[PDB]
Design an enzyme around this catalytic site. Structure first.
Site, PDB file in Angstrom:
ATOM      1  NE  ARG A  29      35.319  24.106   3.942  1.00 44.59           N
ATOM      2  CZ  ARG A  29      35.722  25.403   4.161  1.00 44.59           C
ATOM      3  NH1 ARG A  29      35.042  26.259   4.832  1.00 44.59           N
ATOM      4  NH2 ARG A  29      36.946  25.743   3.724  1.00 44.59           N
TER       5      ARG A  29
ATOM      6  CG  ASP B 106      37.289  29.138   4.210  1.00 47.40           C
ATOM      7  OD1 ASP B 106      37.694  28.529   3.193  1.00 47.40           O
ATOM      8  OD2 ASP B 106      36.381  28.694   4.889  1.00 47.40           O
ATOM      9  CB  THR B 107      33.845  34.051   5.135  1.00 45.68           C
ATOM     10  OG1 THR B 107      34.739  35.169   4.978  1.00 45.68           O
ATOM     11  CG2 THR B 107      34.123  33.532   6.600  1.00 45.68           C
TER      12      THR B 107
HETATM   13  C1  HEM Z   1      30.251  37.845   3.337  1.00 42.38           C
HETATM   14  C2  HEM Z   1      31.194  37.067   3.882  1.00 42.38           C
HETATM   15  C3  HEM Z   1      31.311  37.001   5.348  1.00 42.38           C
HETATM   16  C4  HEM Z   1      30.333  36.736   6.266  1.00 42.38           C
HETATM   17  C5  HEM Z   1      28.952  36.305   6.031  1.00 42.38           C
HETATM   18  C6  HEM Z   1      30.803  37.037   7.601  1.00 42.38           C
HETATM   19  C7  HEM Z   1      30.119  36.939   8.772  1.00 42.38           C
HETATM   20  C8  HEM Z   1      30.620  37.196   9.995  1.00 42.38           C
HETATM   21  C9  HEM Z   1      29.894  36.857  11.269  1.00 42.38           C
HETATM   22  C10 HEM Z   1      28.540  36.251  11.373  1.00 42.38           C
HETATM   23  C11 HEM Z   1      30.664  37.223  12.309  1.00 42.38           C
HETATM   24  C12 HEM Z   1      30.306  37.030  13.777  1.00 42.38           C
HETATM   25  C13 HEM Z   1      29.527  38.272  14.360  1.00 42.38           C
HETATM   26  C14 HEM Z   1      29.286  38.187  15.885  1.00 42.38           C
HETATM   27  O1  HEM Z   1      29.980  37.427  16.633  1.00 42.38           O
HETATM   28  O2  HEM Z   1      28.245  38.722  16.296  1.00 42.38           O
HETATM   29  C15 HEM Z   1      31.980  37.559  11.679  1.00 42.38           C
HETATM   30  C16 HEM Z   1      33.097  38.155  12.377  1.00 42.38           C
HETATM   31  C17 HEM Z   1      34.236  38.728  11.849  1.00 42.38           C
HETATM   32  N1  HEM Z   1      34.450  39.010  10.486  1.00 42.38           N
HETATM   33 FE1  HEM Z   1      33.214  38.501   8.968  1.00 42.38          FE
HETATM   34  N2  HEM Z   1      32.049  37.629   7.496  1.00 42.38           N
HETATM   35  C18 HEM Z   1      32.375  37.520   6.132  1.00 42.38           C
HETATM   36  C19 HEM Z   1      33.529  38.123   5.569  1.00 42.38           C
HETATM   37  C20 HEM Z   1      34.574  38.769   6.234  1.00 42.38           C
HETATM   38  C21 HEM Z   1      35.806  39.221   5.700  1.00 42.38           C
HETATM   39  C22 HEM Z   1      36.085  39.356   4.225  1.00 42.38           C
HETATM   40  C23 HEM Z   1      36.698  39.469   6.683  1.00 42.38           C
HETATM   41  C24 HEM Z   1      38.147  39.942   6.670  1.00 42.38           C
HETATM   42  C25 HEM Z   1      38.535  41.169   6.984  1.00 42.38           C
HETATM   43  C26 HEM Z   1      36.006  39.213   7.873  1.00 42.38           C
HETATM   44  C27 HEM Z   1      36.501  39.529   9.138  1.00 42.38           C
HETATM   45  C28 HEM Z   1      35.824  39.439  10.357  1.00 42.38           C
HETATM   46  C29 HEM Z   1      36.341  39.701  11.721  1.00 42.38           C
HETATM   47  C30 HEM Z   1      37.670  40.318  12.011  1.00 42.38           C
HETATM   48  C31 HEM Z   1      35.405  39.207  12.676  1.00 42.38           C
HETATM   49  C32 HEM Z   1      35.488  39.405  14.132  1.00 42.38           C
HETATM   50  C33 HEM Z   1      34.512  40.470  14.638  1.00 42.38           C
HETATM   51  C34 HEM Z   1      34.277  40.717  16.051  1.00 42.38           C
HETATM   52  O3  HEM Z   1      35.095  40.269  16.900  1.00 42.38           O
HETATM   53  O4  HEM Z   1      33.197  41.255  16.480  1.00 42.38           O
HETATM   54  N3  HEM Z   1      34.700  38.778   7.598  1.00 42.38           N
HETATM   55  N4  HEM Z   1      31.840  37.670  10.292  1.00 42.38           N
END
Ligand code: HEM
Ligand SMILES: [K+]
EC number: 1.14.15.1
Length: 405
Positions: free
Chosen positions: A177, A242-243
């Protein structure tokens, strides 16, 4: 930023809407983007805002783009040009089949045994932060809980010192942002120089922490390298820093105005995994910038190899093709159907941390502070974008309502 119309687009599709300034700064991010779902609007729009970009309105297309990786790629999920010309992070931007090795190291970088020794310390960490607010009859929940708690956990998970928190949250907020003269390239350059001393130290000096894992794990018969370690870490820290920080705040901006639901979380603390996944639906907060692999035909227009389309997860959590109750919110409906966590083509590695720190928040705030409201004469302003935030969340309460837990 507004652009003239590319005449290969036929106008009847065109909609006025910016990703950082959605229909109204006084609404919640789902209710600020909802104008894209009126019954005349196509499944996808061209906005001339932000210099020009395609948006999908409908959960249904979003969930079909999301299925087959061979037709659409997550490989840069961050659509505005500044991020698009400087985003490149592991495992996301690495080609398969080898990508699946990095995914399993990441899967273990995010392993709970290193923090699970710490469960009572992390439960103290929540109490520590609420018990600094509780007799005061107010807080500002962004700064007073949501920044500290999940960051201070992730700083245990990574072996990182808490005095770094103003540094790394500034960087994960400018990338998501923006406002200043720091470009995304500059953000990334400064995060990669902060990361490199820490990485090459763990390389000589491994201990129990995620960064020591991401500096030394094995992948396809070799170890990981420091330039792979810093490139995984950036995306990972934009998760944990952040998320989850924004999600906590929208979850309590909701509860502050809702004195029925705050009883619901204390009549049935067990049911909280339902509620949590209902809040994940109801505040779906991400907009991701899906990459075209090859081609796509719709309503006489055609997309190219290398092109892209923005998928509002705020409207995936809302499409009445996929989601039974769009605005309406009750904790006792069965599993959601959307994409605010992955599907066929890519999948979230880390939301288990965020949804835990929620399911733990939804207890340790409530147990102490079951009644609370936004401060009188205040108002809230949501901060939409590729991942969305809120300006502040100034709360009040009668303090004799509370008990020591
Ligand atoms: C509830 C909070 C969060 C939401 C809603 C969220 C949602 C998502 C979404 C929608 C994707 C994309 C999926 C795709 O491309 O199909 C993403 C990817 C990712 N998330 Fe989360 N996330 C959150 C929290 C976290 C946290 C805490 C971490 C830290 C470890 C994290 C690490 C990652 C990573 C490493 C990717 C890459 C995955 C890949 O390449 O397929 N996320 N996330
Ligand atoms: K790339």
């Amino acid at each position: 930023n507004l652009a003239p119309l590319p005449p290969h687009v036929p106008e009847h599709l065109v909609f006025d809407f910016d990703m950082y300034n959605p229909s109204n700064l006084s609404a919640g991010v789902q209710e600020a983007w909802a104008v894209l779902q009126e019954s005349n609007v196509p499944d996808l729009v061209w906005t001339r805002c932000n210099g020009g970009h395609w948006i999908a309105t409908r959960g249904q297309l979003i969930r079909e783009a999301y299925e087959d990786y061979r037709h659409f790629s997550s490989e840069c999920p961050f659509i505005p040009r500044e991020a698009g010309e400087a985003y490149d992070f592991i495992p996301t931007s690495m080609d398969p089949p080898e990508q699946r090795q990095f995914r399993a190291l990441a899967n273990q970088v995010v392993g709970m045994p290193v923090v699970d020794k710490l469960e009572n310390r992390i439960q103290e960490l929540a109490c520590s932060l609420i018990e600094s607010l509780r007799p005061q009859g107010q807080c500002n929940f962004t700064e007073d809980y949501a920044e500290p708690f999940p960051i201070r956990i992730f700083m245990l998970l990574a072996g990182l010192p808490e005095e770094d928190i103003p540094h790394l949250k500034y960087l994960t907020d400018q990338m998501t942002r923006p406002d200043g003269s720091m470009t995304f390239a500059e953000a990334k350059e400064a995060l990669y120089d902060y990361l490199i001393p820490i990485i090459e130290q763990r390389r000589q000096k491994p201990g129990t922490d995620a960064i020591s894992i991401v500096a030394n794990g094995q992948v396809n018969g070799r170890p990981i390298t420091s330039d792979e370690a810093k490139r995984m870490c950036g995306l990972l820290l934009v998760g944990g820093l952040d998320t989850v920080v924004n999600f906590l705040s929208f979850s309590m901006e909701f509860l502050a105005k809702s004195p029925e639901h705050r009883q619901e979380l204390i009549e049935r603390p067990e049911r909280i995994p339902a509620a949590c996944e209902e809040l994940l639906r109801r505040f779906s907060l991400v907009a991701d910038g899906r990459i075209l692999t090859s081609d796509y035909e719709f309503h006489g227009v055609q997309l190219k190899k290398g092109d892209q389309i923005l998928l509002p997860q705020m409207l995936s959590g809302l499409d009445e093709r996929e989601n039974a109750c769009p605005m309406h919110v009750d904790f006792s409906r069965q599993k959601v159907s959307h994409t605010t966590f992955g599907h066929g083509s890519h999948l979230c590695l880390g939301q288990h941390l965020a949804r835990r720190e929620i399911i733990v928040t939804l207890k340790e705030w409530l147990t102490r502070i079951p009644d609370f409201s936004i401060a009188p004469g205040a108002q809230i302003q949501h901060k939409s974008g590729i991942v969305s935030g809120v300006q502040a969340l100034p709360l009040v309460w009668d303090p004799a309502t509370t008990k020591a837990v």
